[PDB]
Write a protein that binds this ligand. Structure first.
Ligand code: CD4
Ligand code: BCL
Ligand code: BCL
Ligand code: BPH
Ligand code: BPH
Ligand SMILES: *[C@H]1O[C@H](CO)[C@@H](O[C@@H]2O[C@@H](C)[C@H](O)[C@@H](O)[C@H]2O)[C@H](O)[C@@H]1O[C@H]1O[C@H](C(=O)O)[C@@H](O[C@H]2O[C@H](CO)[C@@H](O)[C@H](O)[C@H]2NC(C)=O)[C@H](OC(C)=O)[C@H]1OC(C)=O
Ligand SMILES: *[C@H]1O[C@H](CO)[C@@H](O[C@@H]2O[C@@H](C)[C@H](O)[C@@H](O)[C@H]2O)[C@H](O)[C@@H]1O[C@H]1O[C@H](C(=O)O)[C@@H](O[C@H]2O[C@H](CO)[C@@H](O)[C@H](O)[C@H]2NC(C)=O)[C@H](OC(C)=O)[C@H]1OC(C)=O
Ligand code: V7N
Ligand code: V7N
Ligand code: CRT
Ligand code: LMT
Ligand code: FE
Lengths: 299, 62, 40, 71, 315, 273, 60, 60, 71, 39, 39, 55
């Protein structure tokens, strides 16, 4: 019933984050206790035996096996190789019936997506990085899935739209900015969603005396902006084109593929998994030559 | 053209001149009773000088 | 004023009869509701 | 028992009673109408076996690892 | 208390007189021709708003009550500017706004005529005119910026959504000096009525609540009221002139408010930057610093149109 | 100097503490023991404000900003340049405001008045004490108080509001605003009615209680009476400050989510869940 | 039963009754109009075998 | 014990009693209706073994 | 000790007493109902060994924190 | 004000109504227990 | 006012009623402790 | 003691009882909010299992 407070700005500005202490302990325990333990590494020699491996070309055979154990733990349950594979023939991309193993097709794309996130969007995920667990939480469906609805849905800021600014960078009115008050309402709706997705308030990213200011805002605002650019890449190039792959039970009413948003990783916390650092333990997923100076164990 | 001057600043000083004019008016009205003041050095009006005492006429029933 | 006791008996006789008649039609309403879609 | 009507005005108790019964009847109908099993205006034509039923305890480990929906 | 008198024949020479004070009829609550028309026009405005709200939940009467404070009759889309919009996209809004505005003006006339009939000064209709002035700036400022989309939606929480978004769009309304003045008079109105109400109740034992007698024939209740404030804070009003202080503080709330709205988006588009220009903004140490590459990377776009298609990404 | 009727009233008595020792006037002002303590706290607090301005970046009146300490100091007295100066000024303010209310009680007692004015002013002191004492104490740091600066405290109000995403949805804030707006209407209405009977159009008799009663009944549909309108004004003005104190003390100590999602209870009433 | 009108003024009773019935009837019509199955202004011509029905049990 | 009805007026108490019981009964029904275990309008036809149960201690 | 009733009005004491006991009973029931271990409506059928117990301590990974970094 | 004769007659009904209410509530609880016990 | 004649009889009812209530509550705690002890 | 001649026992009794009730509730809620003495959730733990603050 006590309130925890974190100061995030200068004295007396009231740039502060408030947390109900009992609720936060509960949410935190419900992450730590289910947090999956990682198997330890190895370093064997030799050339690769694989028949139909297309992304994980660059890691040892032991690292590959350890990765597959992690993926099943993170998406399907600790032993559930049958979720993706014809267990009689791991190289298959089809069932014995000939029908495609769509989960394996998706998982191959999810590997490329995760390497793209960790490699190209280090300005967002830094050295925490993401793994399959960050979205999936041990389950096939992440949180925060969204589909086409109406034209003015603000979640399309994370897909095809660009531009949320409404404030004028000058004293006098000009033709440079003709933003409506309705557009300020739309940005305000978008920004409530981001605040809720992280379990923070507006002062985490702004000094609300001037929402346009970057100098007065905490550095987290710059990280947040890279999160928008990352989601546009993730949605447009990886999640949305999987439309022909899924069964129709996964698709929206418009027949579109499920798309991600801030809450999909963050799940209401200021960092995903309260900043648990798992990606450093799984070189298969880095998309980098080194993780925090630790070099990639190539082949 | 004038950079520092702008219409919001012009409007605000127009309001200030009106507002101080209004405070003077109200303080004149506040002195229709109890003035001039008594003092050991003689009568005193303060500032602004009060408006005069005001006589009221009542509706004739005769 | 108030109620005289012979009026109170007359009123009570109606009031109790009305109450029970209401409960009777509510009983049939539950009989019909139960046979259409029982809740236990 | 009739002497209760000496204790209270028989004219006014009737207004209090009908007001109570009307409010209770409306409350129960609107509680039912908002439910799923008894949203009778949409689903009243369903037979009792095919009317909705609320969620049940899994009666098991609640742990058996999933399998994907067939493509 | 608890020894009320009750008067069977008519007081004014419980019950009330039917009669005349000259031109003024006494008895019924006065409407006259302007009052009747005001109620007709205003009723149609209320009906248009409510029927639009109720239609927006698909006529569902349960959702109409459940969702009521979120329901809106919403102004036209921005790209229409001042042109007539489609009926479902703000045409009903402008129609309700028109009838409401006429109804308000007819109510002002009704009040103005009644004051004159009762042989009273015109102070109340000019006080009401200050409130109507602020109201009308929610028409004139959208007109001056050139779009009915900028008008206030009819709705409990929706008009508060507009109030926040207006301050956001124009770069923080706290730095609008007429908003700041309007708040000073709003708070001052609470200060004055607290002080005055407490003063008159504190001398009510001595007949101080008979204020008109105390104005025309100063009693000890007036003298004690004046001396309390003189001894407390060094200056005092009179039993009359305290009502002038009251009148002006209330009137200046909405008058300075209306000027602040009319200036917004027409003369100043970012009040915080106007505050910086004019020296209002207190300095704080920098919370972040951008590199020159970030100054180009972190500029966004101004918000545009919503996507009118559902792209496939067939790849 | 004295009002032409004043000298008659300047008797001893009605003091609370000092007896006859401070029971005197200085110009128009009554002194008394709480006059002495008032001027002490006013002078100390003001000079420490001027010192806070002097060690700050500018003398511009609008930009002066004496800020509270960082939250890390908790309920301790911080270093003076780090916000301990704000804490001393806050004690001086409480001393001044309390002394002012007690001095008003001595003046009312000397004039044979009821205590309505001191108690009405207590509503403002309650709201101040909630902002700088009670809410910071419940949150566990004096650093939650608002900064002393003409615009910098508006930056604080802004950021506190957005700590709850959409502060307009605070239910106690909605009530407090309604009291403030209704008060201002009531003040315009009462002020206009008294002035318009006492200042009728030129060449017209002075009006009467009956006329303002008739007109007021046409405005609201009931007659409030002369004492009733002053009770109403006091109720509205003081009720506004009390509901203001409630609306801020529930924000943080008791509610910590966005204010919009507080309304989830209304959407889930069982008649329509 | 007519002595009941001695206990209650029918001037009062009928105004209350007419008010209750009018409000209740309006509520019922609008509850129907906003449903899928009985949105008769849009779908009144459909014919009973192809009017909507709310979803049968999820366990299907 | 009937002497207690010389202290307290039956008129006052029987109103207060009916009021208290009605409020208490209604509070309990809505508390139960809001629970998972006893949301009987949706789930009343489930057998006792099928009805929800809150989470046990893992102890590990 | 009966002289306590010469001091305090018995008729009024009963109303004060019942009011105190009613408030206290409701406060204790709602405190218990809000707890994990005694949320008896949902979990009353659990055995005493299966009912929740508070932790001997909470735990964390060294890089995790429940609160964001501040100052 | 009331007589003891009336208080006697009142208390008889009052206690009997309390008993009837407690009886019905006891059947209601045993039905509820039989349907879905809470311990 | 209150008499000694009233007071001594009233004290009998209060003490007996208090102790009766505490005894019923003691059994309720016996039952609760048997179902789910708190130490 | 003659102290009951100074202060009305009929007042002191109520003031004392009210003071004790406030103090008792404060201490219970302080303890209930602690980690070590949150007895409703953790009362069945043994003294060597119960929480202790950092050394
Ligand atoms: C003027 C020409 C230009 C004009 C254009 C610009 C200004 C327009 C306004 C002009 C107003 C009149 C000024 C004036 O000279 O007044 C003399 C009179 C004193 O009473 P009196 O009846 O007239 O005279 C009797 C006296 O002469 C003889 O009796 P005695 O010998 O016993 O008196 C001792 C004297 C000594 O005289 C003085 O000390 C004069 C002090 C004037 C101080 C003004 C400060 C203003 C700047 C503050 C900046 C801040 C410093 C911290 O009298 C006294 O003891 C003084 C009693 C008055 C105490 C006033 C206390 C402060 C009032 C509020 C201050 C503003 C708050 C925002 O004092 C007063 O009446 C002052 C209070 C009246 C105005 C209150 C207005 C409040 C508006 C609040 C809303 C603001 C919204 C934004
Ligand atoms: C002033 C008249 C009396 C009365 C006098 C009788 C008599 C006499 C008989 C019954 C009988 C019956 N009554 Mg009875 N009954 C009254 C009030 C009620 C109320 C009620 C809500 O108050 C109810 C639910 C009942 C219900 C019943 C049935 C259980 C039973 C079988 C007949 C039947 O179906 O009647 C259906 C009717 C209703 C549910 C409501 C209307 C009741 C009417 C006013 C009763 C009189 C008509 C009578 C039944 C006609 C046939 C019998 C004649 C002697 C020829 N009565 C009033 C207070 N009732 C019969 C019985 O026990 O048979 C074994 C029987 O012989
Ligand atoms: C995030 C939100 C923004 C903000 C945005 C705005 C905006 C936008 C406006 C204000 C305005 C006002 N704000 Mg601001 N405001 C904020 C913060 C504050 C704070 C604070 C402690 O933080 C305070 C005290 C205030 C206070 C005030 C008032 C001084 C002022 C309104 C005066 C008035 O009486 O209006 C109430 C009176 C009226 C609206 C007049 C109504 C008269 C008409 C005639 C009534 C007709 C009734 C009709 C017939 C009834 C039927 C209707 C139908 C049901 C539809 N603001 C922040 C910075 N504020 C206004 C202003 O003047 O700005 C300069 C304004 O427009
Ligand atoms: C000085 C600034 C303050 C101010 C002042 C003020 N307001 C005022 C006045 C004054 C001095 C008035 O004299 C005037 C008034 O009448 O007061 C009672 C008014 C007024 N201030 C109002 C509101 C108001 N004031 C506000 C604010 C303010 N008022 C400021 C704070 C606010 C806010 C804060 O938002 C509101 C909402 C109104 C109560 C009133 C003006 C009433 C008016 O114009 O009504 C027009 C008519 C309608 C809305 C239509 C009603 C329709 C009926 C409900 C239908 C019923 C059916 C009908 C019978 C059918 C027709 C049949 C015919 C045959 C009759
Ligand atoms: C409770 C209902 C409303 C109310 C009522 C009210 N106010 C009152 C009274 C009443 C009934 C008085 O009797 C009393 C009075 O005497 O009025 C003339 C008063 C009063 N209301 C005042 C102001 C005031 N009231 C406000 C609000 C309200 N007053 C409520 C809305 C506000 C707001 C909202 O901002 C202000 C500014 C004063 C004019 C006066 C009290 C005078 C007093 O206490 O004097 C002694 C103290 C000083 C002269 C100066 C003290 C200086 C300090 C030691 C240092 C500065 C510290 C301060 C915290 C700095 C703040 C800086 C700001 C930029 C943030
Ligand atoms: C699913 O289908 C794919 C091919 O579509 C099979 O993949 C094999 O291994 C890959 C490395 C290789 O690239 C690919 O060419 C293929 O050799 C995968 O093993 C699964 O196979 C089963 O389904 C096959 C299918 O395509 O439907 C089926 O193939 C046979 O039958 C289809 C008609 O139903 C006919 O078009 C094929 O020509 C025919 N091919 C063969 C080699 O028989 C497989 O049947 C057999 C015996 O292989 C299925 O395999 C099994 C064990 O059931
Ligand atoms: C569907 O179409 C609308 C309307 O163009 C697109 O909305 C545009 O982009 C939004 C982000 C923005 O908010 C909105 O103002 C509007 O500018 C929406 O995103 C969908 O886009 C796809 O379809 C576009 C289309 O108009 O058909 C298509 O646009 C290209 O092709 C059309 C001809 O079919 C031509 O008129 C356009 O100029 C052309 N634009 C560009 C930038 O090439 C999009 O194609 C591309 C590459 O953008 C479609 O986008 C995708 C990923 O399918
Ligand atoms: C979610 O879990 C939570 C809920 C939180 C857990 C907590 C639960 C808690 C704290 C529960 C508390 C329960 C409680 C505490 O008090 C319960 C107490 C209940 C009681 C007292 C019930 C008493 C009922 C008595 C009745 C119905 C009497 C009827 C009388 C009748 C029919 C007689 C009519 C006739 C008359 C009068 C004629 C008179 C004659 C006359 C006039 C003549 O003859 O003249
Ligand atoms: C969340 O957990 C937290 C809260 C944190 C934990 C902490 C909790 C704390 C601190 C709890 C403290 C509890 C407490 C402390 O003392 C509790 C004290 C309780 C007490 C004193 C109970 C007393 C009950 C007495 C009763 C029921 C008496 C009934 C009397 C009857 C029936 C007689 C009626 C007869 C009459 C009227 C006839 C009169 C004669 C007549 C008419 C004649 O003679 O004519
Ligand atoms: C069957 O009857 C029912 C049940 C429907 C009746 C019930 C109705 C209900 C429940 C109604 C509820 C109404 C509510 C809750 C309303 C809330 C309103 C609020 C809070 C409004 C707040 C602010 C609104 C403002 C400031 C609007 C201002 C609009 C203006 C100034 C518009 C002016 C337009 C003009 C002057 C002219 C337009 C026409 C032109 C000249 C442009 O020509 C096209
Ligand atoms: C729409 C309804 C459909 C379901 C059926 C409802 C059945 C209702 C049963 C009504 C039976 C009426 O039967 C009986 O009527 C008589 C008068 O006629 C009432 O009699 C009442 O008034 C008479 C005087 O006239 C008194 O002497 C008597 O003590 C009193 O009870 C009874 O109280 C009622 O029991
Ligand atoms: Fe007045």
């Amino acid at each position: 019933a006590a309130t925890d407070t974190v100061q995030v700005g200068y004295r007396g500005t009231a740039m502060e984050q408030n947390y109900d202490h009992g609720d936060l302990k509960t949410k935190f325990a419900q992450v730590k206790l289910p947090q999956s333990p990682p198997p330890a590494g190895e370093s064997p020699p030799g050339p690769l035996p694989w028949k139909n491996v297309q992304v994980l070309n660059d890691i040892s055979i032991a690292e590959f096996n350890r990765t597959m154990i992690a993926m099943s733990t993170w998406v399907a349950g600790t032993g559930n190789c049958a979720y993706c594979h014809n267990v009689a023939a791991f190289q298959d991309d089809t069932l014995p019936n000939g029908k495609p193993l769509y989960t394996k097709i998706v998982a191959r794309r999810m590997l490329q997506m995760t390497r793209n996130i960790n490699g190209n969007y280090s300005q967002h995920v830094k050295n925490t990085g993401v793994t399959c667990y960050t979205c999936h939480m041990g389950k096939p469906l992440p949180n925060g899935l969204w589909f086409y609805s109406s034209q003015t849905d603000y979640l399309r800021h994370y897909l095809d739209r660009d531009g949320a600014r409404v404030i004028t960078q000058g004293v006098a009115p000009s033709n440079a900015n003709r933003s409506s008050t309705k557009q300020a309402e739309w940005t305000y709706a978008l920004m409530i969603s981001q605040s809720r997705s992280l379990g923070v308030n507006c002062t985490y990213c702004h000094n609300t005396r001037q929402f346009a200011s970057w100098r007065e805002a905490p550095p987290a605002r710059v990280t947040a902006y890279h999160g928008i650019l990352m989601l546009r890449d993730v949605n447009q190039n990886y999640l949305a084109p999987l439309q022909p792959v899924y069964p129709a039970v996964r698709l929206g009413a418009m027949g579109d593929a499920p798309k991600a948003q801030c809450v999909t990783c963050h799940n209401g916390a200021y960092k995903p998994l309260y900043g648990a650092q798992m990606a450093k333990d799984f070189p298969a997923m880095w998309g980098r030559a080194d993780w925090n100076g630790v070099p990639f164990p190539g082949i | 053209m004038m950079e520092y001057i702008d219409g919001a600043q012009i409007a605000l000083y127009a309001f200030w001149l009106f507002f101080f004019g209004l405070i003077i008016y109200l303080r004149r009205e506040d002195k229709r009773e109890g003035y001039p003041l008594e003092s050991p050095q003689g009568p005193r009006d303060g500032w602004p000088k009060g408006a005069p005492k005001k006589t009221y006429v009542h509706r004739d029933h005769g | 004023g108030g109620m005289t006791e012979e009026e109170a008996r007359r009123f009570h006789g109606y009031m109790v009869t009305g109450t029970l008649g209401y409960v009777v039609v509510a009983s049939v309403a539950h009989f019909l509701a139960w046979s259409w879609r029982p809740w236990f | 028992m009739h002497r209760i009507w000496l204790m209270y005005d028989p004219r006014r108790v009737m207004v209090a009673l009908v007001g109570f019964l009307a409010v209770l009847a409306l409350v129960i109908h609107f509680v039912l109408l908002s439910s799923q099993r008894y949203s009778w205006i949409e689903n009243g034509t369903l037979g009792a076996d095919q009317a909705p039923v609320g969620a049940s305890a899994p009666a098991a480990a609640a742990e058996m690892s999933p399998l994907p929906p067939g493509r | 208390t608890r020894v009320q008198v009750r008067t069977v024949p008519e007081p004014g020479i419980f019950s009330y007189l039917a009669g005349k004070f000259g031109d003024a009829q006494i008895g019924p609550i006065y409407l006259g021709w302007a009052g009747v028309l005001s109620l007709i026009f205003g009723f149609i405005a209320i009906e248009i708003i409510g029927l639009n709200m109720w239609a927006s939940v698909g006529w569902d009467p349960v959702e109409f009550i459940r969702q009521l404070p979120w329901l809106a009759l919403e102004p036209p889309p921005p790209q229409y500017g001042l042109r007539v919009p489609p009926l479902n996209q703000g045409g009903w809004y402008l129609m309700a706004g028109f009838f409401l505005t006429v109804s308000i003006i007819l109510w002002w006339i009704r009040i103005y005529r009644r004051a004159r009939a009762l042989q009273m000064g015109s102070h109340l209709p000019w006080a009401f005119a200050s409130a109507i002035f602020l109201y009308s700036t929610f028409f004139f400022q959208p007109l001056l910026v050139g779009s009915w989309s900028e008008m206030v939606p009819f709705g409990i929480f929706p008009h508060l959504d507009w109030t926040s978004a207006f301050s956001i769009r124009y770069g923080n309304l706290y730095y609008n000096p007429f908003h700041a003045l309007s708040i000073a008079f709003l708070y001052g109105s609470a200060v004055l009525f607290a002080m005055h109400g407490a003063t008159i109740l504190a001398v009510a034992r001595m007949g101080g609540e008979r204020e008109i007698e105390q104005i025309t024939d100063r009693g000890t209740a007036a003298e004690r009221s004046m001396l309390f404030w003189r001894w407390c804070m060094g200056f005092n009003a009179t039993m009359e002139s305290i009502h002038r202080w009251a009148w002006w503080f209330a009137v200046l709330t909405t008058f300075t408010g209306g000027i602040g709205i009319l200036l917004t988006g027409t003369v100043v588009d970012n009040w915080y930057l106007w505050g910086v220009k004019h020296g209002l903004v207190a300095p704080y140490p920098a919370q972040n610093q951008l590199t020159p590459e970030q100054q180009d990377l972190l500029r966004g776009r101004y918000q545009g149109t919503a996507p009118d298609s559902f792209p496939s990404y067939v790849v | 100097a004295m009002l032409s009727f004043e000298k008659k009233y300047r008797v001893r008595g009605g003091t609370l503490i000092g007896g006859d020792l401070f029971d005197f006037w200085f110009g128009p002002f009554y002194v008394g023991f709480f006059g002495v303590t008032t001027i002490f706290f006013v002078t100390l607090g003001t000079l420490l404000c001027v010192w806070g301005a002097a060690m700050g970046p500018t003398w511009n009146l609008w930009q002066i900003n004496i800020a509270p300490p960082d939250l890390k100091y908790g309920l301790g007295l911080a270093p003076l340049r780090e916000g301990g100066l704000w804490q001393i000024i806050t004690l001086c303010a409480l001393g001044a405001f309390g002394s002012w209310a007690l001095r008003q009680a001595e003046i009312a007692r000397k004039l044979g008045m009821g205590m309505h004015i001191p108690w009405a002013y207590g509503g403002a002191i309650l709201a101040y004490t909630t902002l700088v004492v009670i809410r910071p104490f419940l949150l566990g740091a004096w650093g939650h108080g608002f900064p002393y600066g003409i615009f910098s405290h508006l930056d604080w109000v802004s950021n506190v509001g957005y700590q709850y995403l959409h502060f307009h949805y605070n239910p106690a804030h909605m009530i407090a605003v309604t009291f403030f707006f209704t008060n201002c209407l009531a003040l315009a209405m009462h002020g206009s009615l008294i002035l318009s009977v006492t200042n009728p159009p030129k060449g017209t008799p002075t009006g009467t209680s009956e006329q303002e009663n008739v007109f007021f009944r046409d405005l609201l549909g009931y007659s409030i009476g002369a004492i009733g309108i002053h009770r109403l004004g006091l109720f509205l003005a003081v009720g506004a400050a009390v509901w203001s104190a409630i609306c801020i003390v529930i924000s943080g100590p008791f509610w910590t989510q966005g204010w919009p999602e507080w309304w989830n209870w209304w959407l889930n009433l069982p008649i329509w869940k």
